Amino acid sequence: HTKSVYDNGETLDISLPIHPKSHIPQGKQDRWVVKLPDFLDINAEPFDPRPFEMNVKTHEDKNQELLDKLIAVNTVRWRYAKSETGGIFKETNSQIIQWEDGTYSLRVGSEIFDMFTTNTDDNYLVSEHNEEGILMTESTLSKSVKLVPASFQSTTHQKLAKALSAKQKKESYARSVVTKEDPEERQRRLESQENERYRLERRRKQAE
Amino acid sequence: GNKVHIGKVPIMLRSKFCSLRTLDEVDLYKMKECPYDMGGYFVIN
Amino acid sequence: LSNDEVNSIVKMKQSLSSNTGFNTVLKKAQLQEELEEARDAHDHERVARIEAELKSIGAES
Amino acid sequence: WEEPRLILDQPAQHDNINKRYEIRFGKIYLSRPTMTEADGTTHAM
């Protein structure tokens, strides 16, 4: 019997402000934690075509430019779609597809990335309240999900392979130069000048 | 602060920094170098 | 003769030197070294001139 | 670049003046092999 250490009974009358939720999970407060790959990005901001076109960057490094192009075209985005009835709706370019085997896949455009799920126990999601210095739980993270390219022939995989293969090809640090005179000339001339000023300084100090 | 000279590194023959990497076949004879020589060694003293 | 006088005479004859196989090979090697130096400096303008000069000097038999 | 910094510091009181003298190592420049004669002239080797 490990007796309870705390028996003072002191209690805090702290009241927390909570906001209504736009959605509510049904049947289970379960969520899946998914690691974000390098070739996939999330753009929570609404898609603004004009700033996007005006902010496209061009670099000399072909590998970096190709990687940026791949991540930009593969980035998950969303934008406001004007309905034919005059209303406004949230429109996204990303979907989740479940196959007949029960596996799940993340889809952006025509690209499909498979999901590998590993069950994790005693893993939960919490909401941080920094102003009060306490953590409020949200739900349970039952499964950890990894995103994997569907096949070799997928354009994303081929672009990644090209970028990584040509990235390690460029390696040349030392820069060549042409020597026109003796590399030791500076040292000897500066030593001569230093000895001259040594003699002058010694004479001055003996005369001082 | 600029290019200060720190030393001289011996150069392996027929390597990328050797003078014989270029020069083709004809000039290799004018320099009194055997075209059958394969390099891969240093010349110290 | 002194060393300096020998150098002066050699430079004078080099100015008079129309062509010599040893000297042509040395000039081509120096041009190749200058070309690699320009390449490492990403100077796309000098390298074209050096390539043109190398093409003109070359084509041996 | 394994050891890219040599640092000397000195808290001069001789008026607390903490002076740090640091030298950094930059690029490596290589050249084709060259011969420097006794007279002073240098030429490709």
Automatic annotation (TrEMBL), chain A:
Composition skew (Basic and acidic residues), residue ranges: 171-199
Shown segment, full-protein numbering: 75 to 282 of 429
TM annotation in the entry: none
Full protein name: RNA polymerase-associated protein LEO1
Organism: Komagataella phaffii (strain GS115 / ATCC 20864)
Taxonomy, superkingdom: Eukaryota
TrEMBL record, chain B:
Signal peptide: none
Entry's localization field: Nucleus
Protein origin, superkingdom: Eukaryota
Assembly and binders: Component of the RNA polymerase II (Pol II) complex consisting of 12 subunits.
Function: DNA-dependent RNA polymerase catalyzes the transcription of DNA into RNA using the four ribonucleoside triphosphates as substrates.
Family (UniProt): Belongs to the RNA polymerase beta chain family.
Protein name, per record: DNA-directed RNA polymerase subunit beta
TrEMBL record, chain C:
Domain of life (superkingdom): Eukaryota
Name used for this protein in its record: RNAPII-associated chromatin remodeling Paf1 complex subunit
Gene that this sequence comes from: RTF1
